Design a protein around this ligand. Sequence first.
Ligand SMILES: [Zn+2]
Ligand SMILES: [Zn+2]
Lengths: 45, 66, 92, 48
Amino acid sequence: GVKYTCGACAHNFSLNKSDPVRCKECGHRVIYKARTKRMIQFDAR
Amino acid sequence: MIIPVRCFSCGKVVGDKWDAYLRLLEEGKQEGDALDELKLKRYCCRRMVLTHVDLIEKFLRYNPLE
Amino acid sequence: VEEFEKPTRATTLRLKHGTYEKLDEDGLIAPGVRVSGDDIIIGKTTPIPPYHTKRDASTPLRSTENGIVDQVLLTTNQEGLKFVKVRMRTTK
Amino acid sequence: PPQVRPSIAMDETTQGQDDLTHKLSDILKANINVQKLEMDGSPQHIIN
Ligand SMILES: [Zn+2]
Ligand SMILES: [Zn+2]
């Protein structure tokens, strides 16, 4: 459902609000939300 | 963090002389001589280049999160 | 127990005047999103002890502060419940 | 009036009531069952 990245092995996966909060590959208990795909604008000032 | 693009006071472009400054310091040249060879006359640019701390070299030590 | 979720207009009540469209399906805003003050960044709902019976415990951004969502952390606490930390970055 | 006791609207329309309102409802139920036990046959000590 939502992309996530592991905090230890840095592997990208996805979650569907049903899986336990853990890394699929290395079983790490700390994960981060992946960066959104939307563009971001700055005024360079 | 990283070398600034321009001198804060005057505005001379000094961001392209960091690698040259380090290489000049490699051959044992004094800091004043190295600054002189980079044509940094006004002491604003001299303090811009001389007092910079390259902290980004530390930030690159940590493993990337992706 | 409570849950991190995007509150609904009908089935969920006690909606703050701040916007909710920035939240995702899991109630957590994605990093790299510009937000302003009072905007909801964490959406949490609490069941009413004995439809339209869910307290909104959403945490809004500080009204005097702006910035971009620098980082989002999701994990579990000591007892195993959900745990979210949102770090906002701005320029002074 | 409801101005006297604070009925906090912790969640929109679906709200409970203060303890005073619940106790007033209990008192009214007590008065109703007191009234309903005076025309019909019932022990006097039970009425008291
Ligand atoms: Zn992992
Ligand atoms: Zn200068």
